[PDB]
Design a protein around this ligand. Structure first.
Ligand SMILES: CC(=O)N1c2ccccc2CC[C@@H]1C
Ligand SMILES: CC(=O)N1c2ccccc2CC[C@@H]1C
Lengths: 112, 107
């Protein structure tokens, strides 16, 4: 438990989890359900806000930057795999802007 | 602001001198690269040279605005290029550093 991780849980995750574009991101991409047999050939580290939220709730992370990298991986996976014109990309872009806006006000020094 | 000074002198300086940074220091030249669909796909081009100039001319009102530009630069890369292109790996490496440095930005 640190100040920055607390910020990431109470402010960042909170804002993103409840967002109207969040639903595709709340649980891992299900390649069988979506009919996407190449998903795991292209994305090697899948990530989603369910996993991140669980990690925050279970004090999995040692540094804020580790949680931040998971958010970033989640978004990057989306941009890499999907077509440029897919709606999911716009949804990801919207959530990521909120992520960055919030991260701009995160406590600067990690103190346990 | 203090934050924009940090993005200029600590964050951008670190990214700029990185060994994977050269493709990102100026706008994508679609003519020179022979990529006639680049601008049909990427509608908001961005690069660190534009960001640096914006930091130097007091263009940004807040740190958040400048962070969005970095993000757009990286997202453009992921969206346009093939998943297996080296440039994607290069962007990912630089993006990690960006976020690492951003976490220590003055509040
Ligand atoms: C989050 C994501 O990238 N996807 C996703 C995840 C859940 C629901 C729909 C979609 C659209 C396709 C794509 C594989
Ligand atoms: C930065 C970037 O995305 N590109 C770029 C920019 C400069 C030099 C090479 C490359 C590889 C293709 C791609 C269009």
């Amino acid at each position: 438990v640190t100040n920055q991780l607390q910020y990431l849980h109470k402010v960042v995750m909170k804002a993103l989890w409840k967002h109207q574009f969040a639903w595709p991101f709340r649980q891992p991409v299900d390649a069988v359900k979506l009919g996407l047999p190449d998903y795991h050939k292209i994305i090697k580290q899948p990530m989603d806000m369910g996993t991140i939220k669980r990690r925050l709730e279970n004090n999995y992370y040692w540094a804020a930057s580790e949680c931040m990298q998971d958010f970033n991986t989640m978004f990057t996976n989306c941009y890499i795999y999907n077509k440029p014109t897919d709606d999911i990309v716009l949804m990801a872009q919207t959530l990521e802007k909120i992520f960055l806006q919030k991260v701009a006000s995160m406590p600067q020094e990690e103190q346990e």
